[PDB]
């Protein structure tokens, strides 16, 4: 019956599982329901020996990051806009600064519940569901939502300092679009194939540069958690387009230093001049910054929907959508370890913090990971 | 054909289509000429070469 | 079939399958000529032979398609006159379809829809080729074919005379009276208008009509 | 450098001249080396050329061509869910197909549009590939693979900015659900953006009648999620501050009809705004002016939405046509139907002002015709006049003609058979023709019945019945019951109304029977007829020439004539005898047929189909043994065989049957078969209560080219026939009836297949409750 | 005869009381026709006599009719607004 119903495209598994430094978790502190296979930018913050974690129901955690002992938890469950204790649909990541845990919502809300007890120290609606985590920076809570706006809320009390559309995708094209702050300027992603750096003070467009195409007008795939969110490690924006097209472009003019437009790059970080990118085939690879020269690539990860490539326990670490964590022999193309701490997968990035590696898995929720 | 039986060149329906029986023209008297030729039914009456009826040569 | 033979070999197989009477095999062969070689020196006649294949095969609108595939693809071998005849010939068969006409039972006022189309193509022959080797029949056909349009139009004039819509009788009868210069049903439409005019107290117009009947007695 | 000869190769749709003229340097034209490369490009520019290689022999040119044209095939692979013809269109959207020239430039434009087609399916996950494969003399195959990965699916509707209501309350008007559970039915399971487009108007019309005249959906952003599945719609709305439609200010060219127009535009000052009734109030004016013969009433509202008190004022601007619009009418789509008969089903008459509703009522009669498949029109204005419209009633007639048959008698007992043919108003001539009869060994049967509904334009249904059954029951020859039965019945349907219509007729029932059975039900009847039919032999004779009177009336409220969908029609018809009849009796029946759509889309309509009847003697006699009612299989209680509901064909103790054959046609006969016997064939009763409880059912896998006319129909069917006259004291050794307690049940589904030979209904139905023996036929065919 | 229930024959197209009063003997054809339009009946071969003929049968009780001619001249100037009633 189900044998011949469609000519489905293929996704390969994880090859060459290693455990050479045998991985584990540092603890389990599983919330239960959580990030989900519901698409979510919600990722936990790991600070103060606290797993500040969250759910999509609204349940935001403070798990004491030695065992993930719950310091506090209230639910943020739709406490503005509509009926209370409906699920908050928490979109943006756990941002923790000051006495607030800032989390965006898919019902166009961005909250701030207090880091010490979970009391909602402020909560403020934004315009549209958040493509970004709430970038709480310089008194401003920079959010890039579905409508391409830089919704900037006040940091300690919540007040919409501006909502300025800079780089709007043609729909709610999904991927990180976060307005980062670099060189006194709000450096803005935006899921329409572009990246920008606008003024930090009010979201005043200093430059907008279309890197490449987006989903729409092309048959490029939306199967991409686009980090057009600028990773600026320089006076040079390193970002993607919505077809994942990696580039270097100048931070205060948008002038393309180079571009490794190599397909829908899933997750990229710029680890010095080892630009740790997750390729279109979900391969981890390092480019340089003076030219995206592949230092190495790795087909030990193939079609995984990887997390970010992070460095932890002496190996380059990445999780995926199938609950496999991985430990790259740091640069060159080799697993050292593979942790199957989950199988629901990790929509949250492996937060190599607190001596641990925090993944909130999707519904196999939070484990901090060690080896 | 394997299914062509009792239908050919002869028309379906009323089979009077082929014999092509013409008709006498409408005549109106003195002073009472209502227009009759206004339709295309006032046809070009040109019986130039070839046959009539079913007997017209085909290709 | 649809062979990829030489164009004469697609032709000679097609012509015999016409004379087989298995037109659908001639159709499969004649098209296969004009599928690959419609630039043949018989590919014009092929389309004419296709009309000669289709219309006998009860493939009547495809004959009209091959009437069009002759006029479009193959405007030489000027049997467009034949094609105007054939499209008048086909659409007469296409209009009514019930086989009681073998022993003489009418179907001549149901609706002359393709008989209107058969009129125009017969009219297309007697206009577009009023001299050709086919215009003899279509001229004789058209003076007939208007009556099947008229007897339909008289059956509308029959109803409003039978209903009692005498304002609609004049609408249908003078409709026929403007239309047909030789159908007798129009001459017999004519008194219903007088009957309508007498019913609508337009007796002056009734006797305007009454001497027309005295001349449409002729 | 002027060419003396170009070399023209690469052919079979591009000739020498189709090359040479699309060579910019011709044979004899001077050449340049740019003209050579101009000959490279302009020869490829015909879209037929795999290659162009232009060279020269000093100047004497040489053009080398390989050929793309007529494509000989396009293969479709990986399609199985989507059929290949939908993939053929986007291939043809590139101007590319079999028998036309390959352009290898548009190979991806086959594919990009195909995956953009696959994008617009509701998927996005597809990468498809057109593969050129060359074929004889120029030809190519363009094989296409279709990697149709996954579709997009609604998971959550994130309406944002919604403040008059809550989000899921707006979702409650929408339908973007999944997974019919193990305790509920939710229906749908898939996403389309056009469902959202219908839902965004489901949203606005939800606000528009609650007062929110200035409701606006601000934006909507479909989540174009990785997984290519998650569809979350960022439906920015502004709820729009519900206002009150608080006065209609209708004006304009009201054509002197503003008073009734004002009544059409009567509202409450202070009821919440309703834009749905705002547009309706214009259409109230529109048909009303169209009823006066203003076929084109330009009626235009204006909601002066006064937010200052949350109100709306309704300016309406009317502009009618002019009176005498319907000049003439045309009828179209009746090549198999005479026009004037359907013009008697036309209520808009020419030479009139337009009744906009007059056009519809004849079309409603044409919709209640049943000799149609669709009924519509073309209300065409004759221009140059504000009083000239010629209404071209294009109506699609029936698939006329219908056949009825059992299963075989041919090449079994001589050249003998069963028959039956309907014509469905042969040539639409006001004569619905249905003829039956059979030549058997048992019977030489002819039977004639036709109607003239339009002998008179009133609807005086001039109809008569005739039959002659030379029925001898060739079992031995006539040893079992003979019946030379013949006679007439002429009944004229006179309309009392267009909803009520009267029926009255006479029945001449000349039956010549001889050597009847030893059975039971005729006996107690013929004892009431003053005759003793032979209980112990089969030699009894009885002739009846019954002069009866028939009567009837109907109620007429139901949608269509070939596929009705809503309404309720009531039909009374019974009989009685007159002085002149051999048996004095009556036989009165009634049936009920209502259409109650539990689904107002008429995919599910309750079809309550019941049967009743009672008849006895009029002078104290019995209603005849040939008039006892029946039921069973192929009926409203189908799933048995026929004549299983009712009292049974039971036999007296019996002997020499004029020789019923040796152990053949035993009826307690002399040959074998001693005393009081019976059979599970019902002999039927003078009182009947049987019913069918059916339902329209939609068919998704059936292509709906006939599913508008083909209706699958489930049922649960039960009931009783019973002879109240039956001796339950003499036939207590038999199945004895006086009561509706033999309530036999068979249940299943019926399959009304409307072929071009009319509706041919087939049925599977399992008997569950069975009384007194039923011959059962679980799957039953009803031609 | 003694038969009841005859459905009605409904011809409109006649100059109503506005249409007669809109116009005059002396009015030209289109000056008439601006709120009156064209008739659905004129002369078969004669002048511009614009017949606006009402017909209505009530059923077994005769007919009601207003045959309303507008005899314009050949100049199209109205010479006669002829109101012919039922029978």
Swiss-Prot record, chain C:
Keywords (A to Z) from UniProt: Cell outer membrane, Lipoprotein, Membrane, Palmitate, Signal
GO cellular component: Bam protein complex
GO biological process: Gram-negative-bacterium-type cell outer membrane assembly; protein insertion into membrane
Subunit structure: Part of the Bam complex, which is composed of the outer membrane protein BamA, and four lipoproteins BamB, BamC, BamD and BamE.
Name of the molecule in the record: Outer membrane protein assembly factor BamD
Cited function: Part of the outer membrane protein assembly complex, which is involved in assembly and insertion of beta-barrel proteins into the outer membrane. Constitutes, with BamA, the core component of the assembly machinery.
Main subcellular location of this protein, as a coarse class: membrane
A Pfam family recorded for this sequence: YfiO
Membrane protein topology class: Lipid-anchor
Organism in which the protein naturally occurs: Escherichia coli O157:H7
Record carries keyword Signal: yes
Compartments reported by the entry: Cell outer membrane
InterPro entries for this protein: BamD (IPR017689), BamD-like (IPR039565), TPR-like_helical_dom_sf (IPR011990)
UniProt record similarity statement: Belongs to the BamD family.
Swiss-Prot record, chain D:
Principal subcellular localization: membrane
Membrane spanning stretches: none
GO cellular component, one term: Bam protein complex
Protein localization: Cell outer membrane
GO biological process, one term: Gram-negative-bacterium-type cell outer membrane assembly
InterPro entries: Bac_surfAg_D15 (IPR000184), BamA/TamA_POTRA (IPR010827), D15-like (IPR039910), OM_assembly_BamA (IPR023707), POTRA (IPR034746)
Domain of life: Bacteria
PROSITE patterns with a match to the protein in the record: POTRA
Ranges of residues in domain POTRA: 1-68, 69-149, 152-240, 243-321, 324-398
Keywords: Cell outer membrane, Membrane, Repeat, Signal, Transmembrane, Transmembrane beta strand
One Pfam family named in its UniProt record: POTRA
Subunit structure of this chain's protein: Part of the Bam complex, which is composed of the outer membrane protein BamA, and four lipoproteins BamB, BamC, BamD and BamE.
Function: Part of the outer membrane protein assembly complex, which is involved in assembly and insertion of beta-barrel proteins into the outer membrane. Constitutes, with BamD, the core component of the assembly machinery.
NCBIfam families: OM_YaeT (TIGR03303), PRK11067.1 (NF008287)
Protein family per UniProt: Belongs to the BamA family.
Protein name per Swiss-Prot or TrEMBL: Outer membrane protein assembly factor BamA
UniProtKB/Swiss-Prot annotation, chain E:
Gene that encodes it: bamE
Membrane topology field: Lipid-anchor
Family membership: Belongs to the BamE family.
Protein name, UniProt field: Outer membrane protein assembly factor BamE
One GO CC annotation: Bam protein complex
Keywords for the protein's UniProt record, in alphabetical order: Cell outer membrane, Lipoprotein, Membrane, Palmitate, Signal
Subunit text: Part of the Bam complex, which is composed of the outer membrane protein BamA, and four lipoproteins BamB, BamC, BamD and BamE.
Domain of life: Bacteria
Function, as annotated: Part of the outer membrane protein assembly complex, which is involved in assembly and insertion of beta-barrel proteins into the outer membrane.
Main location: membrane
Biological processes, Gene Ontology terms: Gram-negative-bacterium-type cell outer membrane assembly; protein insertion into membrane
């Amino acid at each position: 019956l189900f044998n011949s119903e469609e000519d489905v495209v293929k996704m390969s598994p994880l090859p060459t599982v290693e455990n050479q430094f045998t991985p584990t978790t540092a603890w389990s502190t599983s919330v239960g329901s959580g990030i989900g296979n519901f698409y979510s930018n919600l990722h936990p913050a790991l600070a103060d020996n606290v797993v500040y974690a969250a759910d999509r129901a609204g349940l935001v955690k403070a798990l004491n990051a030695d065992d993930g002992k719950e310091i506090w938890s209230v639910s943020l469950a739709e406490k503005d806009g509509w009926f209370s204790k409906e699920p908050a649909l928490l979109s943006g990541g756990v941002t923790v600064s000051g006495g607030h845990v800032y989390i965006g919502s898919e019902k166009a809300q961005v909250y701030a519940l207090n880091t010490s007890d979970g009391t909602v120290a402020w909560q403020t609606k934004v315009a549209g569901e958040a493509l970004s985590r709430p970038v709480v920076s310089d008194g401003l809570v920079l959010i890039h939502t579905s409508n391409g706006q830089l919704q900037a809320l006040n940091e300690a009390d919540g007040a919409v300092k501006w909502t300025v559309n800079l780089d709007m995708p043609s729909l709610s094209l999904r991927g990180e679009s976060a307005p980062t702050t670099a060189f006194g300027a709000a450096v803005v992603g935006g899921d329409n194939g572009r990246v920008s750096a606008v003024l930090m003070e009010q979201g005043q467009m200093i430059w907008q540069q279309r890197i490449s195409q987006a989903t729409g007008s092309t048959e490029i795939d939306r199967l991409s958690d686009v980090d057009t969110t600028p990773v600026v490690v320089n006076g040079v924006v390193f970002a993607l387009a919505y077809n994942g097209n990696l580039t270097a472009l100048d931070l205060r003019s948008g002038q393309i230093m180079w571009k490794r437009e190599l397909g829908s790059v899933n997750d990229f970080i710029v680890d010095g001049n080892r630009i740790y990118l997750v390729d279109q085939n979900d391969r981890v690879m390092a480019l340089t910054i003076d030219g995206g020269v592949t230092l190495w690539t790795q087909s030990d990860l193939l079609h995984r929907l990887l997390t970010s490539p992070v460095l932890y326990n002496g190996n380059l670490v990445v999780g995926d959508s199938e609950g496999y964590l991985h430990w790259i022999n740091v640069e060159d193309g080799r697993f050292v370890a593979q942790q199957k701490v989950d199988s629901s997968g990790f929509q949250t990035e492996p937060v190599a913090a607190d001596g641990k590696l925090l993944i909130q898995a999707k519904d196999g929720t939070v484990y901090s990971i060690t080896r | 054909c394997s299914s062509d039986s009792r239908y050919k060149r002869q028309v379906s329906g009323d089979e009077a289509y082929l014999e092509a029986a013409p008709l006498a023209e409408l005549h109106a008297p003195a002073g009472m000429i209502l227009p009759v030729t206004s339709g295309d039914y006032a046809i070009p009456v040109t019986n130039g070469s070839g046959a009539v009826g079913k007997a017209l040569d085909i290709r | 079939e649809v062979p990829d033979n030489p164009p004469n070999e697609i032709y000679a197989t097609a012509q015999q399958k016409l004379q087989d009477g298995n037109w659908r095999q001639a159709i499969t062969q004649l098209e296969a000529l004009d599928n690959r070689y419609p630039f043949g020196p018989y590919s014009q006649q092929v389309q004419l032979d296709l009309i000669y294949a289709y219309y006998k095969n009860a493939d009547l609108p495809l004959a009209q398609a091959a009437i069009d595939r002759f006029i479009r693809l193959n405007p030489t071998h000027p049997n467009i006159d034949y094609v105007m005849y054939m499209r008048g010939l086909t659409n007469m068969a296409l209009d009514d379809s019930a086989l009681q006409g073998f022993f003489g039972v009418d179907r001549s006022d149901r609706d002359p829809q393709h008989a209107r189309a058969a009129f125009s193509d017969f009219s297309k022959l007697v206009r577009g080729y009023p001299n050709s080797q086919y215009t003899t029949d279509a001229t004789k056909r058209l003076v007939f074919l208007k009556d099947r349009l008229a007897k339909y139009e008289y059956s509308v004039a029959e109803y409003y005379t039978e209903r009692g819509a005498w304002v609609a009788v004049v609408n249908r009868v003078e409709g026929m009276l403007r239309d047909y210069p030789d159908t007798q049903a129009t001459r017999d439409a004519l008194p219903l208008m007088e009957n309508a005019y007498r019913q609508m107290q337009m007796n002056a117009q009734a006797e305007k009509v009454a001497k027309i009947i005295a001349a449409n007695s002729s | 450098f002027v060419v003396k000869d170009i070399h023209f190769e690469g052919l079979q749709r591009v000739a020498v001249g189709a090359a040479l003229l699309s060579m910019p340097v011709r044979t004899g034209d001077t050449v340049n080396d740019e003209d050579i490369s101009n000959t490279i490009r302009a020869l490829f520019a015909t879209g037929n050329f795999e290659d162009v290689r232009v060279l020269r022999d000093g100047d004497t040119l040489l053009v080398q061509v390989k050929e793309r044209p007529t494509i000989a095939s396009i293969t479709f692979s990986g399609n199985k869910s989507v059929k290949d013809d939908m993939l053929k269109q986007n291939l043809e959207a590139s101007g590319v197909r079999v028998g036309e020239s390959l352009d290898r430039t548009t190979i991806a434009d086959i594919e990009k549009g195909l995956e953009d087609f696959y994008y617009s399916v509701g998927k996005y996950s597809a990468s498809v590939k057109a593969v050129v494969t060359p074929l004889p003399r120029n030809r190519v195959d363009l094989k296409l693979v279709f990697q149709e990965g996954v579709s997009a699916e609604i998971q959550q509707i994130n309406i944002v900015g919604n403040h008059a209501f809550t989000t899921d309350e707006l979702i409650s008007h929408f339908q973007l659900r999944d997974e019919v559970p193990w305790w509920n039915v939710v229906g749908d399971r898939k996403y389309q953006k056009q469902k959202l487009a219908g839902d965004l108007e489901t949203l606005r019309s939800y606000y528009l009648d609650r007062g929110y005249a200035r409701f606006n959906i601000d934006s909507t952003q479909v989540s174009l999620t990785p997984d290519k599945k998650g569809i979350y719609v960022t439906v920015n709305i502004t709820e729009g501050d519900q206002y009150k439609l608080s006065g209609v200010e209708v004006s304009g060219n009201l054509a002197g009809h503003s008073a009734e127009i004002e009544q059409l535009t009567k509202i409450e000052p202070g009821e919440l705004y309703n834009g749905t009734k705002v547009t309706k109030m214009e259409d109230d004016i529109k048909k009303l002016l169209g009823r006066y013969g203003y076929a084109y009433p330009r009626v235009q509202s204006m909601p002066e939405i006064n937010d200052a008190d949350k109100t709306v004022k309704l300016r309406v601007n009317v502009d009618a046509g002019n009176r005498f619009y319907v000049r003439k009418i045309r009828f179209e789509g009746n090549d198999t139907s005479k026009d004037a008969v359907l013009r008697r089903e036309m209520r808009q008459m020419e030479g009139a002002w337009l009744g906009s509703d007059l056009v519809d009522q004849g079309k409603e009669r044409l919709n209640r015709l049943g000799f149609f498949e669709t009924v519509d029109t073309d209300t065409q204005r004759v221009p140059g006049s504000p009083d000239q419209v010629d209404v071209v009633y294009k109506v699609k007639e029936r698939n006329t003609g219908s056949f009825n048959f059992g299963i075989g008698y041919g090449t079994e007992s001589g050249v003998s058979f069963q028959a039956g043919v309907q014509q469905d108003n042969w040539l639409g001539t006001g004569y619905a023709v249905g003829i039956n009869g059979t030549k058997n060994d048992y019977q030489t049967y002819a039977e004639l019945s036709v109607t003239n509904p339009y002998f008179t334009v009133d609807g005086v249904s001039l109809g008569g019945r005739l039959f002659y059954n030379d029925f001898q029951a060739d079992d031995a020859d006539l040893s079992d019951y003979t019946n030379k039965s013949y006679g007439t019945d002429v009944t004229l349907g006179f309309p009392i109304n267009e909803y009520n219509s009267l029926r009255a007729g006479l029945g001449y029932v000349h039956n010549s029977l001889s050597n009847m059975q030893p059975q039971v039900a005729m006996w107690r009847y013929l004892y009431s007829m003053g005759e003793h039919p032979s209980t112990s032999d089969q030699d009894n004779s009885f002739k009846t020439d019954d002069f009866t009177f028939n009567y009837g009336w109907t109620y007429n409220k139901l949608d269509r004539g070939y596929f009705p969908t809503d309404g309720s029609r009531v039909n009374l018809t019974g009989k009685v005898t007159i002085p002149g009849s051999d048996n004095e009796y009556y036989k009165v029946t009634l049936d009920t047929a209502t259409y109650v759509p539990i689904d107002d889309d008429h995919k599910w309509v309750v079809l309550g189909r019941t049967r009743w009847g009672y008849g006895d003697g009029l002078g104290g006699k019995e209603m005849p043994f040939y008039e006892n009612f029946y039921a069973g299989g192929s009926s409203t209680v189908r799933g048995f065989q026929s004549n299983t509901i009712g009292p049974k064909a039971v036999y007296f103790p019996h002997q020499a049957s004029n020789y019923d054959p040796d152990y053949d046609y035993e009826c307690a006969t002399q040959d074998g078969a001693k005393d009081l016997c019976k059979s599970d064939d019902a002999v039927g009763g003078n009182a009947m209560a049987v019913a069918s409880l059916e339902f329209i059912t939609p068919t998704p896998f059936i292509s709906d080219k006939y599913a508008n006319s083909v209706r699958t129909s489930f049922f649960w069917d039960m009931g009783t026939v019973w002879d109240t006259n039956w001796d339950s004291s003499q036939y207590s050794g038999y199945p004895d009836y006086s009561d509706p307690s033999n309530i036999r049940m068979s249940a299943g589904i019926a399959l009304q297949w409307m072929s071009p030979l009319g509706p041919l209904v087939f049925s599977y139905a399992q008997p569950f409750k069975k009384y007194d023996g039923d011959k059962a036929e679980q799957f039953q065919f009803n031609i | 005869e003694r038969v009841v229930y005859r459905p009605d024959i409904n011809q409109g197209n006649y100059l109503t009381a506005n249409d007669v009063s809109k116009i005059r003997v002396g009015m030209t054809q289109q000056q008439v026709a601006y709120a009156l339009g064209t008739p659905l009946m004129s002369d078969p071969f004669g002048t511009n006599t614009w017949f606006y003929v009402f017909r209505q049968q009530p059923g077994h009780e005769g007919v009601t009719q207003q045959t309303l001619t507008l005899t314009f001249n050949s100049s199209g100037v109205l010479t006669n607004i002829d109101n012919k009633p039922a029978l």
